[PDB]
């Protein structure tokens, strides 16, 4: 019951990927 | 049908990770 | 249910990002 948090955390984890993607460009541009 | 697009876009991000992981293996391992 | 595997595979991708996250701290540590 009240398993509304389960989907939210999965989507929230995706946020880390976004930050990691931005950092990738930084490494290629000093 | 209800907010079906929300989970679809989250899964899409998952595919992007595959590109980021595959690209790392090539650079860190010919 | 019917699509129990669908969310499981999406979560499975998140596990890989966990290892990548470890490398981020190392680079920012030294």
UniProtKB/Swiss-Prot annotation, chains A, B, C:
Compartments (UniProt record): Cell membrane; Golgi apparatus membrane; Secreted
Spans traversing the lipid bilayer: 4-24
Coiled coil: none
Modification note: The soluble form is produced from the membrane form by proteolytic processing.
Taxonomy, superkingdom: Eukaryota
Function description: Receptor for TNFSF2/TNF-alpha and homotrimeric TNFSF1/lymphotoxin-alpha. The adapter molecule FADD recruits caspase-8 to the activated receptor. The resulting death-inducing signaling complex (DISC) performs caspase-8 proteolytic activation which initiates the subsequent cascade of caspases (aspartate-specific cysteine proteases) mediating apoptosis. Contributes to the induction of non-cytocidal TNF effects including anti-viral state and activation of the acid sphingomyelinase.
Domain remark in the UniProt entry: The domain that induces A-SMASE is probably identical to the death domain. The N-SMASE activation domain (NSD) is both necessary and sufficient for activation of N-SMASE. Both the cytoplasmic membrane-proximal region and the C-terminal region containing the death domain are involved in the interaction with TRPC4AP.
Assembly and oligomerization: Binding of TNF to the extracellular domain leads to homotrimerization. The aggregated death domains provide a novel molecular interface that interacts specifically with the death domain of TRADD. Various TRADD-interacting proteins such as TRAFS, RIPK1 and possibly FADD, are recruited to the complex by their association with TRADD. This complex activates at least two distinct signaling cascades, apoptosis and NF-kappa-B signaling. Interacts with BAG4, BABAM2, FEM1B, GRB2, SQSTM1 and TRPC4AP. Interacts directly with NOL3 (via CARD domain); inhibits TNF-signaling pathway.
Disease note: Periodic fever, familial, autosomal dominant: A hereditary periodic fever syndrome characterized by recurrent fever, abdominal pain, localized tender skin lesions and myalgia. Reactive amyloidosis is the main complication and occurs in 25% of cases. Multiple sclerosis 5: A multifactorial, inflammatory, demyelinating disease of the central nervous system. Sclerotic lesions are characterized by perivascular infiltration of monocytes and lymphocytes and appear as indurated areas in pathologic specimens (sclerosis in plaques). The pathological mechanism is regarded as an autoimmune attack of the myelin sheath, mediated by both cellular and humoral immunity. Clinical manifestations include visual loss, extra-ocular movement disorders, paresthesias, loss of sensation, weakness, dysarthria, spasticity, ataxia and bladder dysfunction.
Annotated protein name in UniProt: Tumor necrosis factor receptor superfamily member 1A
Species this chain originates from: Homo sapiens
Source organism phylogeny: Eukaryota, Metazoa, Chordata, Craniata, Vertebrata
Gene: TNFRSF1A
Covered residues, full protein: 209 to 238 of 455
């Amino acid at each position: 019951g009240t398993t509304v948090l389960l989907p939210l955390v999965i989507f929230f984890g995706l946020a880390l990927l976004s930050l990691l993607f931005i950092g990738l460009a930084y490494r290629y541009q000093r």
